[PDB]
Curated annotation (Swiss-Prot), chain C:
Belongs to the T7virus major capsid protein family. This is Major capsid protein. Assembles with the minor capsid protein to form an icosahedral capsid with a T=7 symmetry, about 60 nm in diameter, and consisting of 415 capsid proteins. The major and minor capsid proteins are incorporated into the capsid in about a 90/10 ratio respectively. Once the capsid is formed, encapsidates one single copy of the viral genome. It is found in: Virion. It comes from Escherichia phage T7 (Bacteriophage T7). Homohexamer. Interacts with the connector protein and the minor capsid protein. Interacts with the capsid assembly scaffolding protein; capsid proteins and scaffolding proteins form building blocks that assemble to form the procapsid, each hexamer of the major capsid protein interacting with 2 scaffolding proteins.
Length: 50, 49, 49, 49
């Protein structure tokens, strides 16, 4: 959506992008999993803060 | 002569009234109406026209 | 989820949030400060069959 | 003198709806208990036929 969340500024969501890494050079089946792991930690934390 | 009604079920799913008996009654009144009007037209015109 | 409802066309749910819990300094007013509570709902409309 | 923090039972609120014109707004229009039927149309049959 654009500019529209629910209950004033009371809450809000986000979608965590991969941090400083590219999808192209990936599909090496190893670095992928690690990246997804750390990024998912960031996602979990981002949820907790909410 | 006849009267016919078809109803999508999906509307009878979300309705919140009956409409059955009402429909039936309306069909009957339609019948009687048609009969009477037809007759009156017939006597009036066909006798003297 | 899966919470089920009969009858009408579409469904919606009310929500609400938080609070502010403040001390009451004795010998003062309880009507002094109320920021109340925010109130809004989210609506969901079914798709046919 | 009006009293602010009126708790605004019904209202849009939310976030980006701006507006907040009047009240209700959010609420449910509900009648499930009765129907309005069209008129019974009498007839001249049989009688004088």
């Amino acid at each position: 959506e654009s500019k529209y969340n629910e209950n004033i500024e009371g809450l809000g969501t986000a979608t965590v992008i991969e941090t400083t890494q590219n999808k192209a050079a990936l599909t090496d089946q190893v670095a992928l999993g690690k990246e997804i792991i750390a990024a998912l930690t960031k996602a979990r934390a981002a949820l907790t803060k909410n | 002569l006849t009267a016919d009604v078809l109803i999508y079920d999906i509307e009878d799913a979300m309705n919140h009234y009956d409409v059955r008996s009402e429909y039936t009654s309306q069909l009957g009144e339609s019948l009687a109406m048609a009969a009477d009007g037809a007759v009156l037209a017939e006597i009036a015109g066909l006798c003297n026209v | 989820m899966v919470r089920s409802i009969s009858s009408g066309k579409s469904a919606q749910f009310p929500v609400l949030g938080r609070t502010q819990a403040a001390y009451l300094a004795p010998g003062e007013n309880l009507d002094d400060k109320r920021k109340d509570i925010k109130h809004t709902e989210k609506v969901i409309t079914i798709d046919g069959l | 003198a009006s009293m602010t923090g009126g708790q605004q039972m019904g209202t849009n609120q939310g976030k980006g709806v701006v507006a907040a014109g009047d009240k209700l707004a959010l609420f449910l229009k509900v009648f499930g208990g009765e129907v309005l039927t069209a008129f019974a149309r009498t007839s001249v049959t049989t009688s004088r036929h």
